[PDB]
């Protein structure tokens, strides 16, 4: 097994303040305003109004 071939793929990610190109399969919801909610915008999560 030490001499057998192995295919390698290295995935390199960038997380900048820029539009998202690749995304997870998480499903979206409607906006809720003026309420204390948990939010998730392009994978950036938080709690607030």
Partner 1 sequence: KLQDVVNQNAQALNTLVKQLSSNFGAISSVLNDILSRLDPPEAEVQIDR
Partner 2 sequence: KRISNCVADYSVLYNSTSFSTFKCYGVSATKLNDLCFSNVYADSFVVKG
Residues lying near partner 2 in the complex (CB under 8 A) are found at 1-16, 18-26, 40, 42-43, 45
Answer yes or no whether residue 37 interacts with partner 1 by CB under 8 A: no
Pick from 1, 10, 15, 49: which binds partner 1 (CB under 8 A)?
A: 15
The tally of CA atoms less than 13 A away on the side-chain side of residue 18 is 5
Beta-sheet pairing, 44-48 with 37-41: antiparallel
Q: Which partner, partner 1, partner 2, none, binds residue 10 by CB below 5 to 8 Å per kind? A: partner 2
Would you say 17 or 34 has its CB closer to partner 2? 17
Distance from C-alpha of 7 to C-alpha of 42, rounded to nearest angstrom: 31
């Amino acid at each position: 097994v030490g001499h057998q071939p192995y295919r390698v793929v290295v995935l390199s990610f960038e997380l900048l303040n820029a539009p998202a190109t690749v995304c997870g399969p998480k499903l979206s919801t409607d906006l809720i305003k003026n309420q204390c909610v948990n939010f998730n915008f392009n994978g950036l999560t938080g709690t607030g109004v």
